[PDB]
Structure formats: structure tokens, C-alpha cells
Amino acid sequence: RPPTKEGIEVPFRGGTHPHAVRFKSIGIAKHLLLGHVVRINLTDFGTVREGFPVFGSILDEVARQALQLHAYHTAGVVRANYNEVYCYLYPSTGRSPKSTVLHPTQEQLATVRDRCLLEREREVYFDGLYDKKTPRERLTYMRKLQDGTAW
Amino acid sequence: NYLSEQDALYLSPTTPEEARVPSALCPQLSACVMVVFAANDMRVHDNYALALAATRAEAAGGLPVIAVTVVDYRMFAQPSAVGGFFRQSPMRARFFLETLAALRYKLERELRIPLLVRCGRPEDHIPRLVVECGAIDVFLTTQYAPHEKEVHNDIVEAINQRRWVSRDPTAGYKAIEHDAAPVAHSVWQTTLVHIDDLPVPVASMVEGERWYHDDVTTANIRPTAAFDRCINRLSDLPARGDLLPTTGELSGLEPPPLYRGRAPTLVELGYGSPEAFIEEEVIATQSSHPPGEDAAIERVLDWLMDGGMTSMLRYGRDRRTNTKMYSQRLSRLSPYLSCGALSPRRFYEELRRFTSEHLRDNFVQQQYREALLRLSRRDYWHWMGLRYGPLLFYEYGPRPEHTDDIADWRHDPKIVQKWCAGLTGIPFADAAMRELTLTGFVADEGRQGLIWLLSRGYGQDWRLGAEWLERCSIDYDPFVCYGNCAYYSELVRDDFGETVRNIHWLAHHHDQTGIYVKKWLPQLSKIPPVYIHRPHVLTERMQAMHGVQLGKNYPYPLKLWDGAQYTLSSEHLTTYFSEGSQWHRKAKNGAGGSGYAEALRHGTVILEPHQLQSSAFGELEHG
Amino acid sequence: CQSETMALRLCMAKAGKETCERESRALDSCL
Amino acid sequence: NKMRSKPSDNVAWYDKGPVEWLPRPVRLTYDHLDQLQQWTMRATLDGRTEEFNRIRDLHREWSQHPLMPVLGDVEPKFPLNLFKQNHRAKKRFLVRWHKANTPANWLWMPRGPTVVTPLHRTNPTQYPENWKQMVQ
Amino acid sequence: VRHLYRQTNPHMDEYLASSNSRVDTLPVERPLSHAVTFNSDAEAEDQLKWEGFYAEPYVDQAPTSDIDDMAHTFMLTNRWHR
Amino acid sequence: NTFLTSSVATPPISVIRTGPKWWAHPERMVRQKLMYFTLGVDQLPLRRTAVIQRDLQRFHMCKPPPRVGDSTGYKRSRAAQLNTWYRRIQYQEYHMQHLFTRHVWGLLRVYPGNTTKIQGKADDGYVGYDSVPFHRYNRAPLPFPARELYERRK
Amino acid sequence: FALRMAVANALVKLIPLTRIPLKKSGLLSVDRRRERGQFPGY
Amino acid sequence: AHGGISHFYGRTPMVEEVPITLVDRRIMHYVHHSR
Amino acid sequence: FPDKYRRVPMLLKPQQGGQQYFNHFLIRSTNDRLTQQDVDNASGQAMWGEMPRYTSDMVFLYLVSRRRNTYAVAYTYEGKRILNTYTAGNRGLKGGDRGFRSEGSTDNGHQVTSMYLNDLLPKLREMRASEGRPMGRGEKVELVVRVMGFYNGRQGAVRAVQDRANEFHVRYFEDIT
RNA sequence: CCAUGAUAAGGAUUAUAAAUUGAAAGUGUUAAUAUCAUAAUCAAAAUUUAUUAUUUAUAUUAAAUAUGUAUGUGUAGAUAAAAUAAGA
Numbered sequence A: 001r002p003p004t005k006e007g008i009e010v011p012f013r014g015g016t017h018p019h020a021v022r023f024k025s026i027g028i029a030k031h032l033l034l035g036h037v038v039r040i041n042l043t044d045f046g047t048v049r050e051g052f053p054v055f056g057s058i059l060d061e062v063a064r065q066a067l068q069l070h071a072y073h074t075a076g077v078v079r080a081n082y083n084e085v086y087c088y089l090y091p092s093t094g095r096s097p098k099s100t101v102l103h104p105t106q107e108q109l110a111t112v113r114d115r116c117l118l119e120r121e122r123e124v125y126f127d128g129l130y131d132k133k134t135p136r137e138r139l140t141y142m143r144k145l146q147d148g149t150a151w
Numbered sequence B: 001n002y003l004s005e006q007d008a009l010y011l012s013p014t015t016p017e018e019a020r021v022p023s024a025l026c027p028q029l030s031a032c033v034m035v036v037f038a039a040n041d042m043r044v045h046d047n048y049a050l051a052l053a054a055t056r057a058e059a060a061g062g063l064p065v066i067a068v069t070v071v072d073y074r075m076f077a078q079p080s081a082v083g084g085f086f087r088q089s090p091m092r093a094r095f096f097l098e099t100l101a102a103l104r105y106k107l108e109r110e111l112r113i114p115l116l117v118r119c120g121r122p123e124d125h126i127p128r129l130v131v132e133c134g135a136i137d138v139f140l141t142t143q144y145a146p147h148e149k150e151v152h153n154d155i156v157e158a159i160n161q162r163r164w165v166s167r168d169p170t171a172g173y174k175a176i177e178h179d180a181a182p183v184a185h186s187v188w189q190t191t192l193v194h195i196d197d198l199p200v201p202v203a204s205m206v207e208g209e210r211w212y213h214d215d216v217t218t219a220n221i222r223p224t225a226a227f228d229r230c231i232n233r234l235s236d237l238p239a240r241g242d243l244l245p246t247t248g249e250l251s252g253l254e255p256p257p258l259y260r261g262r263a264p265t266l267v268e269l270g271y272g273s274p275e276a277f278i279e280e281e282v283i284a285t286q287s288s289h290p291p292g293e294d295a296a297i298e299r300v301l302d303w304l305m306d307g308g309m310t311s312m313l314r315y316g317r318d319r320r321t322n323t324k325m326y327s328q329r330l331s332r333l334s335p336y337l338s339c340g341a342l343s344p345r346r347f348y349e350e351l352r353r354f355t356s357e358h359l360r361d362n363f364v365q366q367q368y369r370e371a372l373l374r375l376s377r378r379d380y381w382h383w384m385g386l387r388y389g390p391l392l393f394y395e396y397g398p399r400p401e402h403t404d405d406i407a408d409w410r411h412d413p414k415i416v417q418k419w420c421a422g423l424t425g426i427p428f429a430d431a432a433m434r435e436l437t438l439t440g441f442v443a444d445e446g447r448q449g450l451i452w453l454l455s456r457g458y459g460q461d462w463r464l465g466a467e468w469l470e471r472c473s474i475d476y477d478p479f480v481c482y483g484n485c486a487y488y489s490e491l492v493r494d495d496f497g498e499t500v501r502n503i504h505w506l507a508h509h510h511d512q513t514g515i516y517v518k519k520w521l522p523q524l525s526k527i528p529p530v531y532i533h534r535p536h537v538l539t540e541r542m543q544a545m546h547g548v549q550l551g552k553n554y555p556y557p558l559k560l561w562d563g564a565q566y567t568l569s570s571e572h573l574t575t576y577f578s579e580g581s582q583w584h585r586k587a588k589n590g591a592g593g594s595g596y597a598e599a600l601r602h603g604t605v606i607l608e609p610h611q612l613q614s615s616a617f618g619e620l621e622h623g
Numbered sequence C: 001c002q003s004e005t006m007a008l009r010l011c012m013a014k015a016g017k018e019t020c021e022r023e024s025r026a027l028d029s030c031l
Numbered sequence D: 001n002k003m004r005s006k007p008s009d010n011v012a013w014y015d016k017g018p019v020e021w022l023p024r025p026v027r028l029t030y031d032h033l034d035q036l037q038q039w040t041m042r043a044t045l046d047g048r049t050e051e052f053n054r055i056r057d058l059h060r061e062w063s064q065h066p067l068m069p070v071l072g073d074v075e076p077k078f079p080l081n082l083f084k085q086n087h088r089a090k091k092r093f094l095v096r097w098h099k100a101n102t103p104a105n106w107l108w109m110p111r112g113p114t115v116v117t118p119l120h121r122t123n124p125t126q127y128p129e130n131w132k133q134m135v136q
Numbered sequence E: 001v002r003h004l005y006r007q008t009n010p011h012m013d014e015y016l017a018s019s020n021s022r023v024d025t026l027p028v029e030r031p032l033s034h035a036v037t038f039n040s041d042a043e044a045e046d047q048l049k050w051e052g053f054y055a056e057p058y059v060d061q062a063p064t065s066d067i068d069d070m071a072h073t074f075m076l077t078n079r080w081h082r
Numbered sequence F: 001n002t003f004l005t006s007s008v009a010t011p012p013i014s015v016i017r018t019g020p021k022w023w024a025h026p027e028r029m030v031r032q033k034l035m036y037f038t039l040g041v042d043q044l045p046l047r048r049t050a051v052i053q054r055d056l057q058r059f060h061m062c063k064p065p066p067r068v069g070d071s072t073g074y075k076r077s078r079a080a081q082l083n084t085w086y087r088r089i090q091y092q093e094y095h096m097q098h099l100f101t102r103h104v105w106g107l108l109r110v111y112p113g114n115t116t117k118i119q120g121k122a123d124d125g126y127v128g129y130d131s132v133p134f135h136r137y138n139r140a141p142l143p144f145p146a147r148e149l150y151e152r153r154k
Numbered sequence G: 001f002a003l004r005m006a007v008a009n010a011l012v013k014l015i016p017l018t019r020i021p022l023k024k025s026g027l028l029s030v031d032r033r034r035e036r037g038q039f040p041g042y
Numbered sequence H: 001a002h003g004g005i006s007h008f009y010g011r012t013p014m015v016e017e018v019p020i021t022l023v024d025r026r027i028m029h030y031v032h033h034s035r
Numbered sequence I: 001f002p003d004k005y006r007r008v009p010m011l012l013k014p015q016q017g018g019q020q021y022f023n024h025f026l027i028r029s030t031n032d033r034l035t036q037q038d039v040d041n042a043s044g045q046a047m048w049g050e051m052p053r054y055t056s057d058m059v060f061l062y063l064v065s066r067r068r069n070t071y072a073v074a075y076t077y078e079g080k081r082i083l084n085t086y087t088a089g090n091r092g093l094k095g096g097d098r099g100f101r102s103e104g105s106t107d108n109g110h111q112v113t114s115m116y117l118n119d120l121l122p123k124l125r126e127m128r129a130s131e132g133r134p135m136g137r138g139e140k141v142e143l144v145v146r147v148m149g150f151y152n153g154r155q156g157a158v159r160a161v162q163d164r165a166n167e168f169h170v171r172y173f174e175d176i177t
Numbered sequence J: 001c002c003a004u005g006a007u008a009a010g011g012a013u014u015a016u017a018a019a020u021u022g023a024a025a026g027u028g029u030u031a032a033u034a035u036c037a038u039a040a041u042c043a044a045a046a047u048u049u050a051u052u053a054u055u056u057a058u059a060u061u062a063a064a065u066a067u068g069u070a071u072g073u074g075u076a077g078a079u080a081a082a083a084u085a086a087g088a
């Protein structure tokens, strides 16, 4: 078979210093030039409200480094899990040619952030009451809801 | 006789009331849109013809959808061109009929689409039913193989010309009597990469597997959601409930209405003396193929889930190695892809989704690329068969320029009998033949070994082996099968491709330990792995120690070593097809079992006998 | 006992149909 | 839970030997023994010895002493794997091996006209029903 | 310190004979020769070893390369976990 | 006979390994001896397996002799040879029992269990009143008056 | 086995010299084997 | 040159004139002793 | 691990039967010894040197075993290649299903050498017949075996060449380091 | 809302030979769980709610209301168990 490029993943964390963000963005641009599809995921960011601005700043840094290194790529839809916020950057390789550095707009980022915040809030306030055991787990979850720490 | 009575019942000038599709009650439902199903597609999930018919009916209004499937009666009971082998052996025929029943259940119970099953000549049955039903659009797939391309062309011509058929003679008629200008839409849906999307034209395509893989790297694959949406919206279209089966018919208390159709059986198709077609051997494999579409989807999901992706490439290798033919982790999806129950686009989407989900692993992309490479290899064989055309099925392959070293194709009925019965001396070839004859499927390495051994190893004609693999393998695709047979018989000698390897090389490479041979022939279990793949080398003491007596069980090889005429006699070289053999004592009258001229010996309905077939039968009778 | 072992093993190699109980007894006695 | 149309190993072979290999269990009762005694009495009173001759031929064919196996000849055994208890794999291997080892392919049993059986009468003429044919 | 050949050999019709003059497209091995009489020891012992006399009756259900594959997989697992 | 339901098949090694419970049960062995005797044929394999089972059961309690003293080169091979020879004799007896049971069934007009073959008059496995409408292993549909194997009278 | 043991003991009581053969043949030797008692766990 | 007298004909350390299985086993034992 | 029959007495494991026959056997033995004594009394009353010298018909066979491979080649006295080298990778045994450890094993070398010799014999006959030198009805070709490598496949190769001694006759067995 | 106890899993080895019918089952810890001595806002009658070891083909609902849906050649992967009046 023709050699498939490895689907690399670059970890990120809420609270990374701008020097580390710059270095990781440089590495991301390097791998995009090499042709690897990269994945950017924020692991530890607390609530989804505080994890989105840092992700946007990371996207801006990656965009600047890609503009400097001539690594044109397209960013996919930003998907926020409960624990992480992740996105996929696809470089110009094979079937899909990409000649420009493309990033989601702030309007799209705000819509995604609102949707994910609603999803997380609805999940914590509704699903947890039913997805666990009734005699003890349900009572503990009700205690957490009363305390306000159920999130 | 069954074909004659079917013709006299349906293809009759008057078309009696019993064999007449009931008229609709609402005037709008008088017209409808018809679809033709065939052996190339028995699915309702990614059928381009079905989606196009649904869209046409939606555009026209409340136009009902009707489905017709006419079985090719010739393909089930007519003898092979060379050697008189069966075509669509009962093992394949049962699977085909079960898949047809599954498709009918899917259409009539889930989609509420009445499917009408007919037996006889497709080119006669289809246009007459078009005229009787008054269909405006007939949607069907494009068959491009001999005995299918010609029948498809005849069908579309007769649909365009509005031709009725009566089958006392071969007679056609105009549409003035029917006791709207219909149009036929032929769509291409067989290949994984749809035609007109290929990066290079077929005519100017360079003959090369690796070249086609590099082309499919750039080429795109059509999605399935677009057609799934049309299939889903098909349910909102009104349907003619009078054509649907009733509860009694579903329970089987009464036979289906005569205008609907009756699913044929083995005896009705022409298979005689079934006792001679019962292979009493040990089925070492532990996996089956449940016929159907939902079953195929479930099999795909289970193969993806249970870690079957390692069958493509072992983890962390990046280089193809010997396969494990004894494993159950292989994707046995070739029957479901050849019969059209599973669509290549759906399988590709499943592979892509699985790879994306497990992309965190650093090797799933290589396995996905290997699977896509195999699908593209199937498409490449389709394209090469289309390029070769009728030349693919002639002697010495399509290209005589590569056959300088090939002999004159010495043909021996007894040698072909032993080869097709698995009575050779190579354990790997014997095990592969046993698996193919019992299960109806064997691995790629087994197929390569069998075809090479018959064509180049023994000097027999390659068409005999190709037709025997057609008879046995339930996943028989004409183009893929014949192209691979030609390639591995050293007939098509395209460079920059897979090397043709010896049967001994395959045995030493893919079965070095001998698990596969010791599992499919457990009487050889005691032979050490050093002496397997060559048990004839053993002396009398060694064979008595290992419990394998040559001549008694597991006879001597077809290809004796140098000499072996002075140190061996008839006591050691035991015959297997003489007058007093078990093979004669079968069929409850005595003609033989499975093998050379089996259609002539057992088949009830034989059409256009040949001088070679008659001479072979006479020689078999004399011997 | 080299001689007894050699005799027993020669019997085993040469005569697979019949075993030498005499040789086996000689071996186990000399051992 | 899953439904499989796979032919299980319990498929019988109705063309290898008078009794199908891996035979179904049979229950022979004293009622059967009494019926057999009555049938034999009636047959011997009528004088039809053909069935007895056929039974004797079957016994002569299939009732010969097996041969002494040479040392090293033993039935294959299942390897001791570390993957827990492969009970199903062991059962499948054993059933497959015993299905392959059909009675026709039993090499230890001397069967056929070539072998000499110095324990049973060769032909029905030697049996006491032909006592008049061996006189003086 | 041909016709005549088949008439003469009725059993050979169902088999094939290789040419001793030149190597055929399908090579077939000849039976090996063993020592009927041994001059000394360590000869019958070697013959018994090569005849499978001391070979375990256990049937190979998994290949020996499975352990190597598992070791390589574990190494790569540790590598990507690092 | 009186047992007419579906039956599973077991390897002969399993029944041989079953000692004086089913295979070596004295009452069953006496029944087999009576079956041979009423047909007027010798019971040589039955007597061979009988003496083998008697010798095995008499000393099954005793502990095996020390294997260290026994020579693995010769004694273990001899023991394996004897065990295989006994197992083959028991296989022959088992086959003879099944064959003669089928023959006596055919003579006495005894309808066997489902999917049971009686050479001479069934040849493919008689099946009747089964849970499955179709004949197993043959896929042949079955009538309601399953099969009259023998003549009506008596 | 229980009947045989009882008869052996009766013979030993009746004729004292019969004690030696029966004892050497192990007919008065009782075995303490006992079937497993009832238990809902199994 | 691999025929007749060869390059290694003078550089052959061990030569034994003629079964040869015993000779091979003895030579392997001597090599094992050396190493 | 524990004893299965610990609860059965030793006198019952196993129980010795036939006690009544011992006295009769002893008396019979005494009588037999007495009559043996009686009959005994009655009878009493009544370039040069150890370097091998080659021949032009002898074929030089080279067997080179490696750590994970093995090779068998042959050459005529003139120095021509009778047949190309047969390797484990050429035969396909190195491909897998046994592991890298099994590469260059005793059995692997044995089967590679056997295949090479079987393919060599017709090629050797054709080569001999090319120059008008028939082999004859009885094939006894003299070969000089030269073994190199000191590995497990060496024993298999020498066993394989020892096999088929009717057709192949070893004249000199030399080792090369 | 009491966090503290039990339990699960679960192993150890001396009995020569004669006599005798005799002279023969033992648990830490790691774990999970819970109803007890210890820290206030809420489970036990109105139960759907999915909780491992089940009756397969000659005859099948009468005493507290006591089961109408899985025939398909008995055909996967994993999991558990024993040398104990039985007969490796």
C-alpha cells in the first residue's frame, strides 16, 4: 500500500503558558508541512466557558505559525466532550487539496461554545439523576445538586 | 420440463387470468415505476436504481413502485463449456435462493414493495411484464458480462420498442395488444468507485494493479446517505396492497398467487440425485455466512468490533506477510459483495467510520489502506475484465503474447476428477479444495494454489479450473474469478504486480506450522511440521509411526517423483474412479459423484449438447 | 551400561514389529 | 443468542460404512432381545439361513483382532494453552479427529479378502446347516 | 571397513510421471533413504530423532510467531504510551 | 424403539473413557452378549473389552508406580502402545455393538431414533415426528405419515 | 460392599481362624468414604 | 573460483574423508569446545 | 494435588484376592521340587598427503547456514553453477507462521537442502547430457560437501544430504569457518 | 446517611516396616460491600422493570390470581468449577 501519514495528536491543557502554546503550534505547523493530519485537544480546562477562549487563542497561534511556514490546512468542526475540547486540522494531502489557511470564524466559535455549554448543563442537571443507582448514587447526586458541586 | 411449463404458463399469447397481475383500484395507481433486480444487486440500502426509481415516482406523484426478479434458469442447470461441470452448484443455488427470499422479505415486509419472482428467460419475462403492468420507467443496473451484458441489451431494446414475447416459438410482438412510451434507465452501481469518476479513462487506462491503487488514492467515493434518503422517502409513496402476500402465504399454508411467482427449488431448477452432491468430510472452519442484507451488515460490524482488522495487516508491520487461513478473524464478506447484498460504498463507509473512531491508535490507517487496496483490486479486476471483453474466457487467456512458455493444454478427465475432488498429494492444496467444496469459500492463497496447481502444476486447461471454482465458490464474480485465474495461470503476465508463487512456496509460507492442513485433514495430525507438505517422502516405518498409510488414506501425489514406475505397483497406487470404486456407487442408480461431466451425468435439463461433452461421456462410460 | 543401551536401541530401530523384552530386562538389570 | 445456520459437527455421514459414523445413541432392551429370539426361532424353523449367513459374514469382516501399534503411534492430544480453558476448541478438535477416523479407514483392523482369519468359517457351506454335504 | 504405455501400465493412467531429464514446473521430492543397519551408536539415535519418535503428539493450534507478534505489539504499545 | 426423539452424537473416546458407569456397566454388557449369542456369533471383542475393563477397574484404586524408576525412553512408549492397543480394541467393540444394534433393528422392524441410519432399508437416516419440519443434514421435507419402513402385516 | 463386610465379620465371629484370610484380603477393612452433604452453595 | 582447487581449498581448517552425520556432529562439538 | 483415595484403606488399595490358593500353590511347589529332586537323582544314577585429490566428475556442494537463514548451492568441477542458490526466503519458510527464532532451524535447513537436491538431480542430468556424458541407469553422483556457519540448520542440511544416499554419494565432508 | 465489623478470593505439611479398620480440610491479606458505637431535611407499598446456574416431541390447567412466545444441522468469543462414594 502507499504509505499513509500518521494521524498525530498534540495534547493541550487549559493553563498552558504562551511559550508552550507557541512551541506546540510550531510543532503542529511542522507536522502539517510533513502532511500529517493533526488533532488539538484541551484536556484540563474546568468548565466549557473557560476552555473556549484558550482554544481560540491556540487556533490563532496555529494559524500564525502555519502562515509563517506556508502550511495551508483546514480546521474541522470543534467538538467539545465533557472532559476535552478537540478539533482536527487537515493539511493539503491527496484527494482534498487546500491552498489556504482556513479557520472557523468567531461567530461559529461562539455558536459552538453556546451549543456545548447547553449540552453540558443539560447533561449535568438532567441525565445524572437517572443514569446511576437509585438507593445510594441517586441520593449522592441529589446531595451534590444541593451543594452546587454536581458539575 | 419445468422451464417448458413455466413458458407455457407465463409466456403465452393469451396470458390466462391466473397468471395476470391484478389491476389497481385507484386510476392513479394504474401506472407505476418498475425496478429489475439481478444477481449483481440484492440490497435495499445502497441501490442506485432503487433510489432513482423512488425519485422518479416522487416527481411523477403518487406513482407506486414495483420490483421484478427473474432468475436465469440456464445458469443453474446448464453444463459448463469445458469438462461438463455444473454451473451454480446446489450449494451456491441454495445460498442464491435464500438471498432472494431475504430480499423479498425486506421489500415486502419493511418497505411494503411487492416483489415478483419469475423463472425462465429474463429477456422474455421482463418486457412482457413491463407491457402488462404499464410501467413508465424501468430502472435496472448495468450488467457488462457475457450472458448478462447481452441479456441486458436485449431487455433494454425490448423495453424501448415495447415488445411482447410468446415462447412457443421465439416470437416477438408489438404493444398494440396487451391481453405510454416506457423508458429504461440503466445505472452503474457495481464498482466501489462509480464510473465517470475515474481519474483516468478505462480505454486509456494502463494495465496495472498498483497504478489503479494510485488512481483510487486520488479518486473519490460516492456517499450512501443521499440514496438512503430516497429509500426512506419511498415508504411515503402509496403502495398496491393487493400485490402484497397474505398471512397464510407468509405462513406457507398455501402457495403464492400464480401472478406473483413461486421460488424454485433444486429439483425444479434441474439438480438431480442430491445424494451424490453430499460431501461427507470434516468442516474445520467454525464460521458460516447467513444469507441476507441485515446479516451482512451485522457481519461487517462484528468483524470490525472483534479485532478482525488485523487480518489485513498485523499490528505494527507496514509490510504484508503470510496470512492465517485457519483463522476466524478474516472478513468473509466476498459472497455478500459479489451477490450485491453488501454494497462496496457501505462497506467503505463502515471501514472509514471505524478507522476514524479508532484513529488514536497509530496503525489503524495502514489497515484501512489495505482494506481499501483490496476493494480497489476487486474494482481493478472488473475494469480489466471489461477491457479484455470476450477474450478473457478464451484458451490461453486474453493475451497470447505472454503465453510463449505455456504448453498445449493437455486435458485428462481423471486428473481433473482427482484435482476437483481434492485427491492430490499436496496437503495445502487438498485442504484448500476441501474447504472450498464444503463451505463454498476459501482464502485468496488457497485459490491461488488451486488454480496454479491445476493450470501450470499439472498441465491441464485453465478453463476447467476456472469453471470448477465458479461451480464451488459462493462468491463467484465472473470478472474477478477469470482474471485471477488467468493471472495466476501465467496467462496474463502484467509486470509491476504480485508474483506467481509455487504451491510449495505457498505451503511453506502461509502454512509453515501446518495448523491449517492438520485441521482440514486431521488424519495427518501426527506428521511433524518438517515432514508435512511432503508426506510421501516418509518411509514405511515413519508412516506407520505417524498413522498415515499412503494409498489407504491420503493417496500418493498426482505428480510422481523421478522414477516411481519401477519401485511402485498397483498395490501401492490405488485407483479412485475405477468400476469398483465408491465414486461409482452413488446417485442411487450409479453414475458418479461430483466432478467431470457432472451436469451431464446428473442434470435433468440439458440444452445444446456438445460433441466434446458426448465424447467425454462415452469415454467415461467405457472407462 | 553402554552395551545394554546400545542393544536395546538397536532392537528398537531394527525390529519395530517386535520388542526385545530380553534386551529390556538386561538393560534394567545392568542399570 | 445469535442464530447460526452453520452445519454443526453433529452432521452424520450416511455413505461411510453400514452404521453412520459418530452414530446416534441406541437403547437395546430385553423386549428387543425377546423379539430377536422369537424371530430367530421362526427363521430357523422355516429353514431360511440366508440372514444368518449374512450376519456371520458381517461378524467375520468386522470382528478381527486389531494389530499391535508400533511404538510412537498414539492419538493426537490437545496442547495445554495459557488462554484459560479452551474447552470448545478441545471438543471441536476431538470431534473432528474422530469423524475423520472413520471405521473404513481403521488401519489396525485386518479387513478384506486378502487377510486370513483362522477363527471363523469362510463360507456358509462350512456351517452345520450343510451337514449332509460333508459325509463319509 | 501413449497407447502402449497405458496398455502396459493400467495404474499410471490416473497419475502423472515427471521427466528425469529436466526439472518440471512442479517439483516433487523423492523418498529419503534411511540406514537399515547401523555400524555403531549415535546413528540409530539420530534416525529415531529424525523419524519423529521423540516428538510430542500435541497438535499445533497456534503458531510460534504469535508470541513474537505479541511481544512486538507490547513494545509498540509501550512506545506510543511513552 | 421406545426412544424416538432427537439425539446428539459423542466421540467413541468419550464413551470408552467412561468406565464402569455406562460403557463397562455389567448389565449393559450382558445385554450385548445376549444380542450376540441369540444371533449365534462369537463375542470375542466384547470379552476382550470385558477383561480389559475388569483389569483396569481392579487396580484403578492403586497408585501408579514411580515414574522416575520407569525409563521415559522405553517404558513410557510401551505404556502408550498398550493404552492405544486397548483403546483400539474397545473402539472395535463399540463399532460392532452399533452395527449389530442397527442390524437387529432392521430385522425386528424397530424404528430407530431421528437421523439414525439402518443399512439396508434407510441408508440415509430415518427421521420421524421431529421438532424440525425438514430432515436434518438432508434438508428434505418430511410428510406427516413420516415413513413406513416395513411391511404392514404383523 | 456393606453386605460383604457384614458377612466377613460374621464369619470371623463364628470361626476365629478365618480371621487371617479375610483380614489379609481386606474384607473387614472399612472405608470411611462418604458422599458430600447438602449445601445450597453448590 | 569454486571448482576444483578453490580459494578456500588451502584455507579449509577441518577435512574428514568418508555416515557424514557423525562427522558433522563431531566437528560441531569441536567448534563448541573451541568457542 | 491431594490424594483421591486417601479415605480408602491401604489393604483395600488394592485388595489381594485368592488367599485360599496360596496354600495349594505352596504344596504343589513342594511336590514339584520333590519330583525334580527325584528325577535329578535318577539321572545321576543313570597439495599432497592428507589433502583430498578431487575428480572432474565430482560436484562441489556448499551448505552455508546463517543465524536466521540457510543456503544450498552446487558447482561442477569446471566452476559452473548447476543450479541457483536456494534460500529460506526463496523457499518461503522465512515468511512467518513460525517466528524469527525458527528461521535457520534444523528442520528448515533440512527441507531447504532436500528441495535443492531434488531440483538439482534433473538439472545435473541435463548438464551432464549436454556434453554427451550420460549419467546411466544407476544414478550415483559423487559430491563433496562443504559446510559453513556453525548453526542449527547445519545439522538439518547434513541430514538431508545424507538422505537419498542411493543417488548422492558423499566423497569428502569439509568445514569452512 | 451509622464506618465500622464480618464476608468474598484463598493457599500450609509429618505419618519406616509390621499390626490395626485403622492414625487424619486449614488461614493472612488484598478487595468489594454493608442494615453496627460515632456528622438534621428525608426508599419500602400505588411495585414494569429489565437482577448467572430453566421443564425439547406416546397421553400435557381441579381449589388462595399463578405466564402466548426463542422449533431452525445444537453451530462463536470469553467465564466459572472439581482431583472429596466413587470408578484421569
Ligand SMILES: Cc1cc2c(cc1C)N(C[C@H](O)[C@H](O)[C@H](O)COP(=O)(O)OP(=O)(O)OC[C@H]1O[C@@H](n3cnc4c(N)ncnc43)[C@H](O)[C@@H]1O)c1[nH]c(=O)[nH]c(=O)c1N2
Residues within 6 Å of the ligand: B330, B331, B332, B333, B334, B335, B337, B338, B374, B375, B377, B378, B379, B381, B442, B443, B444, B445, B447, B448, B451, B469, B473, B475, B476, B477, B478, B480, B481, B482, B484, B485, B488
Ligand atoms: C483463482 C482465484 C479466483 C478468485 C479469486 C482469486 C483467485 C486467485 N478471488 C479473489 C480472492 O480470492 C477473494 O477476493 C478473497 O480471497 C476473499 O476472501 P476475503 O473475503 O476474506 O477477503 P477480504 O477479507 O480481504 O475481503 C475484502 C474484500 O476485498 C475484495 N478482495 C480481496 N482480495 C481480493 C483479490 N485478490 N482480488 C479481488 N478482490 C479482492 C473482495 O471483495 C473481498 O470481499 C475472487 N474474489 C471474488 O470476490 N470472487 C471470485 O469468484 C474470486 N475468484
